[PDB]
Every structure is written in structure tokens, then in C-alpha cells.
Amino acid sequence: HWGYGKHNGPEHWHKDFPIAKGERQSPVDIDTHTAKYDPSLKPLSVSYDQATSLRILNNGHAFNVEFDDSQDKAVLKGGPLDGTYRLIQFHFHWGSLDGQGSEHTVDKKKYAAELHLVHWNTKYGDFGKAVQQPDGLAVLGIFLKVGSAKPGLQKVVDVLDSIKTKGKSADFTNFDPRGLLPESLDYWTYPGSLTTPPLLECVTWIVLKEPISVSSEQVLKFRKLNFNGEGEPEELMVDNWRPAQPLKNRQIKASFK
Ligand SMILES: O=C(O)Cc1cccc([N+](=O)[O-])c1
Numbered sequence: 404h405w406g407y408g409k410h411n412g413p414e415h416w417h418k419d420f421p422i423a424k425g426e427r428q429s430p431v432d433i434d435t436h437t438a439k440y441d442p443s444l445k446p447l448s449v450s451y452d453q454a455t456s457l458r459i460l461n462n463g464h465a466f467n468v469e470f471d472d473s474q475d476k477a478v479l480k481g482g483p484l485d486g487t488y489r490l491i492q493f494h495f496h497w498g499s500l501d502g503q504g505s506e507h508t509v510d511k512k513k514y515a516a517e518l519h520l521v522h523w524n525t526k527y528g529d530f531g532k533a534v535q536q537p538d539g540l541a542v543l544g545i546f547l548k549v550g551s552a553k554p555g556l557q558k559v560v561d562v563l564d565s566i567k568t569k570g571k572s573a574d575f576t577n578f579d580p581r582g583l584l585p586e587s588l589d590y591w592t593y594p595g596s597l598t599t600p601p602l603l604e605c606v607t608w609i610v611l612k613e614p615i616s617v618s619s620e621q622v623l624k625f626r627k628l629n630f631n632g633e634g635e636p637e638e639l640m641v642d643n644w645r646p647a648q649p650l651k652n653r654q655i656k657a658s659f660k
């Protein structure tokens with residue numbers, strides 16, 4: 404099945420998922436000089452004070468931190484969005500080396516990792532319905548650069564030993580995702596897709612301009628995870644990013660001058 408190896412990686416996905424060659428695929432390169440400032444874009448509203456984290460899972464492709472999305476407890480509104488989007492999970496993409504790992508690029512620059520906070524539009528009632536709609540999902544993307552440690556990440560790093568292999572989960576309550584945000588909420592936005600199969604074209608992307616800093620030791624711990632299940636040959640979970648796709652007939656908008 405699909406993955407990030409030589410024989411099953413991004414360049415092969417189109418055979419099972421023909422939408423891989425579609426008109427609104429993600430990620431993309433953000434060309435800062437051709438993005439257009441749009442004064443009509445509103446500030447983002449991130450309301451995460453009542454978030455309820457539940458569990459952390461190694462799904463064989465990344466690790467997900469899952470939230471209770473049965474009520475409006477952790478929501479995203481404003482920005483380019485109409486309506487209310489509820490947080491369901493976050494996950495990361497990262498590299499084998501500090502000079503790669505992000506999915507989006509900025510003037511062709513790759514960051515060490517990229518955080519995706521995934522939200523679904525409450526008008527569609529459940530996540531599975533929302534992914535079938537062009538405005539179903541809103542994903543907040545945050546870049547990670549290597550430098551100073553991020554204290555609010557450490558609780559995630561320390562539990563990774565307990566979910567080393569595919570299919571393992573652990574209880575993960577009382578985690579506050581506000582400790583992952585940068586100071587500024589200035590952003591770029593464009594219409595795109597999921598970056599893993601099934602690659603559905605259901606996402607409004609909101610990519611923050613300001614990266615967060617994490618330490619070398621924090622990222623090194625991500626690279627100790629395994630793509631494989633327990634008692635199968637070890638293959639390190641690294642380079643779980645899709646490369647940039649053609650922009651086609653899309654414009655990237657900026658919230659800032
Ligand atoms: O890989 C999956 O399971 C599909 C999936 C599910 C949720 C969010 C996703 N995204 O691209 O942000 C992708």
C-alpha cells in the first residue's frame with residue numbers, strides 16, 4: 404500500500420488515487436513575491452481554551468493527537484472561512500535531516516518539519532461528510548525550524564517511545580495546543596487538498612508566516628518512530644512529506660502587507 408519509500412512513495416500514488424494529478428493538489432511552493440495581499444481577509448480566530456485531547460496514535464504514516472470533536476470546544480473561525488470549523492487532530496511531517504521535512508515551501512525554502520492542525524466544517528455534521536465537500540476542511544499549517552526548544556512540544560516528544568510502531572496508541576489527555584502556536588497569526592491561504600491518500604480536494608489551507616523553533620533533540624525524537632508494526636523489520640519514520648505540486652489555476656492570498 405501507499406507510503407514514502409522508493410516503490411510506494413508520492414510518485415506512485417496516482418495509480419491508486421488518480422486525483423493525485425488533479426487541479427487543486429497540495430502542498431505548493433509559496434512564492435512570496437506573487438502572493439497578493441488581500442485587505443478583505445479577516446484575522447484568524449483560534450479558540451482552543453476548551454480543547455479536550457484524548458489520545459495519540461501511530462498510524463503508520465505519522466502520529467496523530469486526537470481531540471473530542473463532539474461539541475464546539477476547540478474551533479477555528481474567521482480568516483478566509485465562513486462558519487465554524489472544529490479541531491479533530493494534529494500531526495507533523497518531518498525529514499531525515501534538518502534541511503528538509505516540510506510539505507509547503509516558501510520561495511523554495513524547506514523547513515525541518517510542518518505541523519497540521521486539522522478542522523472540519525460543522526455544517527456537514529461529521530468529518531466523513533466534510534471531506535466530500537470543497538469547503539469541508541480547514542488545515543492550519545505551521546513551519547518548524549531548528550533552534551531553541553519549544554517547551555509546549557515536550558509533552559508530545561516524551562510519549563513517543565510508547566507509540567513507536569504502527570497501530571500503537573496511548574492516552575493523551577489535558578494537552579493544550581495553544582503551546583504550539585507562534586506569536587503572530589499572519590497567514591497565506593489557498594484552496595487545496597489532503598496531502599496523503601485519498602488526496603481529496605476539500606481543504607482551505609491557512610499557512611502561518613512565522614515558524615516556531617524546536618530543538619535538535621526534539622526533532623531527533625520524531626525520527627526514532629517506525630513506519631512498521633511491532634516485530635516487523637524496522638524502517639525509521641522519516642521523510643513523510645509530499646513534494647510541492649503544480650499551482651495550476653490558483654492564487655495564493657496573504658493577510659499581511
Ligand atoms: O492520511 C489520512 O488518514 C487522510 C487524512 C485525514 C485527515 C487529514 C489529512 N490531511 O491531509 O490533512 C489526511
Ligand SMILES: [Zn+2]
Pocket residue numbers: 494495496519598
Ligand atoms: Zn499533514
